[PDB]
């Protein structure tokens, strides 16, 4: 096989079009991506035109987190009621506008001090389910020591997200960084998988971007594909970033990246 | 016009010191963060340092941190880079640039300096010798040979800028004597060699050597 | 620090095409990347928002897309003056870092080189050095062979050459190879030839000169 139709057939596979959204923006809750909440897909197609329009952030191991959610095939999110006693929740920012108001990532709770007191937070979450939980949390990096003190009443914030198997400790990096939507600060995003029977543990003294719940980790038969090809009304079992392709011939030279039953390369 | 004029570059011995200046005009120097960027010969762009508009807020690239020092003077609309403990790898063309921050978001470095060359070597400057390339089918070619000079660069113009079409000034070659040599040529109508005078205007700033040599058939 | 890897390093595109350049980050970032056009003998300029495009008209023909790890620079219509070495930079976190650069090479129809030879000037021969320069003017593609001959004897190791950057108008090259010998060795001979091998030439062309 050597030619492609140029379009991605919406059948028989479940095709979810990202449009102006990446997977991580839909994962975190960028207000332009709220329409992607809880969505299921067999193949999720990221676009080149996808862009971030919320609070500026990085993900240290971006490639692997993008692989976990892509395989689960779902963005299903179940809220949990953490006991954030003594802190101000629902932190908002003018860089992440939702419905003409200052907002933030839908799936993230940015905690600030309460009455200029912000105590050592300790929360346990048991994961009594029969399936892997994916917790998404972050670390805020204030621009100045003045910004650190004003937000958290703590010059040296520390964060530790632990389980019975793993532990992650992150320290903020105070400093100036190029203004993104008028924000010289940033946020580092991390994730933790809590397997059934294991407890999620959080030990934040400052700067925490608290999670709001978990994502379900399903059987990884789904995947992700970078492609600019349009989504079309047709039926084809093989899918390549150049478009859908028939699977009658035994070999193909269109693209090495494929999804579904495809000819060998 | 928006200007960033650069000064201070030259030839310096290893371990020696040198200072650069990026004088600004056209815009308000007091509101822009300034940057120093260099590319070595055969290398790509390399960010070096940065000041915030209010001063006292700096950080450096690891390659030069501890040796170089960036500084600001909003009164004289100028940026300074103090280069100490210079080494061979520090030889590059150093640029200065501001940060464009339209609305509230950073977009990149829009206005760039003209370029200034710093050559760190144990060698000394030597002026070039300029020799004509005289014409001997229907269109003739003539030029000048700018042989044996150091360091880079030299600039060559024809008739003080009147003759521009057809000119090809070639990149230099570092011949085995440790000196550079290039040739600039221009093709002209073969029937105007007697009616038109052709002079190349070689300039070699590091040795204060500028020569107007006549190319005569 | 955030490191960038740029692909490809060299790129040869015909006129009027659509070309995309990719940069990849070591760490995923939400901020886009900034792109730059580096002409020879000029300061690099900001691509994505050139001149006063934000203050004045929006239209532009350089597109910079990508979020996360893979970003891209797209040129909607390749032009003969697009010859440069493009660079991408991240502005998420200092230190600011660039890529290795992508040298776009505008491609033209095959052109034939004009060959000229220059005898050493009188003022050289007094200083004790002879330099014989041979010019290859306005040719394409780059690959061309310059062969020096002294009394029809092959010459190697005593010649150097350099090529200009591709022209911003006719997208051609130009080459100059120089032959260096002493005054004594120069006057030991009388026939110096310059043989040029090139695609646009059906047979090698030799420009020579006596005395
Ligand atoms: C994905 O992103 C693109 C690019 O940002 C979006 O296209 C943009 O859509 C907006 C509409 O909100 C257009 O703005 C319009 O401008 C006119 C002229 O002032 C104004 O009268 C309208 O009221 C509106 O504000 C904008 O021009 C347009 N840009 C481009 C390049 O097409 C697109 O809507 C996003 N979503 C999707 C699903 O594609
Ligand atoms: C996390 O620590 C906080 C305080 O550091 C706990 O809140 C206190 O818990 C102790 C132990 O049960 C009580 O004696 C106190 O009355 C509680 N309140 C205060 C103000 O100290 C909290 O219970 C701890 N987390 C969990 C899950 O037990
Ligand atoms: C914070 O936001 C959540 C969800 O948006 C909401 O349920 C809650 O009432 C808000 N306020 C507090 C104090 O949690």
């Amino acid at each position: 096989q050597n030619s492609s139709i140029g379009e991605i057939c919406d059948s028989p596979h479940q095709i979810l079009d990202g449009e102006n959204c990446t997977l991580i923006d839909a994962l975190l809750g960028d207000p332009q991506c709220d329409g992607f909440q809880n969505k299921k897909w067999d193949l999720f197609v990221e676009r080149s035109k996808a862009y971030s329009n919320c609070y500026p952030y990085d993900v240290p191991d971006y490639a692997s987190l993008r692989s976990l959610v892509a395989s689960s095939g779902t963005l299903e999110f179940n809220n949990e009621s953490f006991n954030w006693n003594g802190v101000t929740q629902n932190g908002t920012s003018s860089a992440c506008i939702r419905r003409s108001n200052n907002s933030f990532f839908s799936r993230l709770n940015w905690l600030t001090h309460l009455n200029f007191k912000y105590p050592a937070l300790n929360v346990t979450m048991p994961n009594n389910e029969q399936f892997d939980k994916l917790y998404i949390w972050g670390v805020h990096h204030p621009v100045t020591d003045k910004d650190q003190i004003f937000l958290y009443a703590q010059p040296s914030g520390r964060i530790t997200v632990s389980t019975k198997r793993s532990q992650q400790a992150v320290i903020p990096n105070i400093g100036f960084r190029p203004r993104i939507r008028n924000i010289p600060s940033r946020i580092s995003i991390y994730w933790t998988i809590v397997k059934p029977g294991d407890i999620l543990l959080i030990n934040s003294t400052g700067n925490l971007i608290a999670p709001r719940g978990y994502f379900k980790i399903r059987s990884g038969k789904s995947s992700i594909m970078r492609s600019d090809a349009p989504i079309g009304k047709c039926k084809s079992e093989c899918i390549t970033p150049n478009g859908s392709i028939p699977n009658d011939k035994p070999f193909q030279n269109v693209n090495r990246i494929t999804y579904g039953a495809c000819p060998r390369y | 016009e928006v200007q960033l004029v650069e000064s201070g570059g030259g030839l310096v011995q290893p371990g020696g010191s040198l200072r650069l200046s990026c004088e600004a005009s056209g815009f308000t120097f007091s509101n822009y963060e300034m940057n120093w960027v260099r590319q070595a010969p055969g290398k790509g762009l390399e960010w070096l340092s940065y000041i915030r508009s209010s001063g006292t807020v700096t950080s450096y690239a690891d390659s030069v941190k501890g040796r170089f020092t960036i500084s600001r003077d909003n009164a004289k609309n100028s940026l300074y880079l103090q280069m100490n403990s210079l080494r061979a790898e520090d030889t590059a063309v150093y640029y200065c640039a501001r940060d464009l921050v339209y609305t509230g978001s950073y977009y990149g470095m829009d206005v760039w300096g003209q370029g200034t060359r710093v050559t760190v070597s144990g060698a000394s400057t030597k002026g070039p010798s300029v020799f004509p390339l005289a014409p001997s089918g229907g269109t003739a070619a003539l030029g000048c040979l700018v042989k044996d000079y150091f360091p880079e660069p030299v600039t060559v113009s024809w008739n003080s800028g009147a003759l521009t079409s057809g000119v090809h000034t070639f990149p230099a070659v570092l011949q085995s004597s440790g000196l550079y040599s290039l040739s600039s040529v221009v093709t002209v109508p073969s029937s105007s060699l007697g009616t038109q005078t052709y002079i190349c205007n070689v300039n070699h700033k590091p040795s204060n050597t500028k020569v107007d040599k006549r190319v005569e058939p | 620090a955030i490191q960038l890897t740029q692909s490809p390093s060299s790129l040869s595109a015909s006129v009027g095409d659509r070309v995309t350049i990719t940069c990849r980050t070591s760490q995923g970032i939400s901020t886009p990347l900034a792109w730059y056009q580096h002409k020879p003998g000029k300061s690099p300029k900001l691509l994505i928002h050139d001149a006063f495009s934000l203050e004045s008209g929006v239209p532009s023909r350089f597109s910079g897309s990508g979020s996360g790890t893979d970003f891209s620079l797209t040129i909607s219509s390749v032009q003969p003056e697009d010859f440069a070495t493009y660079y991408c930079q991240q502005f998420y976190d200092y230190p600011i870092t660039f890529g290795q650069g992508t040298r776009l090479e505008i491609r033209r129809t095959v052109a034939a080189p004009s060959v000229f030879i220059f005898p050493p000037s009188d003022e050289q021969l007094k200083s004790g050095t002879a330099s014989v320069v041979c010019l290859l003017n306005n040719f394409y593609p780059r690959e061309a062979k310059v062969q020096w001959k002294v009394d029809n004897a092959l010459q190697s190791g005593n010649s150097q050459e350099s090529v200009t950057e591709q022209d911003s108008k006719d997208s051609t090259y130009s080459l100059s190879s120089t032959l260096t010998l002493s005054k004594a060795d120069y006057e030991k001979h009388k026939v110096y030839a310059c043989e040029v091998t090139h695609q646009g030439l059906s047979s090698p062309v030799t420009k020579s000169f006596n005395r």
Side-chain angles (χ1 to χ4, degrees), chain A residues 79 82 84 87-91 98 105-106 108-109 111 212:
Chain A
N79 285 312
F82 294 91
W84 307 116
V87 305
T88 297
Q89 304 185 6
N90 289 324
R98 191 176 306 183
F105 296 101
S106 65
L108 293 173
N109 187 358
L111 302 176
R212 293 182 182 272

Side-chain angles (χ1 to χ4, degrees), chain C residues 61-172:
Chain C
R61 68 182 179 91
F62 287 95
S63 296
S65 66
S67 180
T69 296
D70 297 340
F71 303 180
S72 295
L73 174 66
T74 300
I75 302 169
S76 65
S77 178
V78 178
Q79 299 298 322
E81 70 273 17
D82 291 332
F83 178 76
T85 298
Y86 292 96
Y87 290 95
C88 69
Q89 96 171 24
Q90 55 82 28
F91 51 87
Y92 179 82
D93 174 71
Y94 291 43
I96 299 168
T97 56
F98 288 94
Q100 292 178 355
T102 300
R103 59 188 69 185
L104 185 148
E105 192 272 329
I106 185 67
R107 179 173 288 170
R108 194 188 192 273
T109 63
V110 174
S114 297
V115 181
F116 295 102
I117 192 165
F118 292 101
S121 66
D122 288 332
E123 185 176 358
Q124 288 195 0
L125 296 173
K126 189 264 182 293
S127 67
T129 302
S131 297
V132 181
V133 180
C134 188
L135 176 60
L136 279 70
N137 195 7
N138 293 114
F139 61 92
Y140 189 77
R142 189 183 311 202
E143 288 80 4
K145 183 177 179 180
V146 176
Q147 188 70 43
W148 284 105
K149 291 179 182 178
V150 176
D151 288 333
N152 201 2
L154 286 307
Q155 300 297 320
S156 65
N158 58 3
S159 66
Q160 286 174 350
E161 52 176 351
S162 68
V163 64
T164 64
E165 296 295 331
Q166 192 174 8
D167 192 77
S168 65
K169 295 177 73 174
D170 65 358
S171 295
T172 62

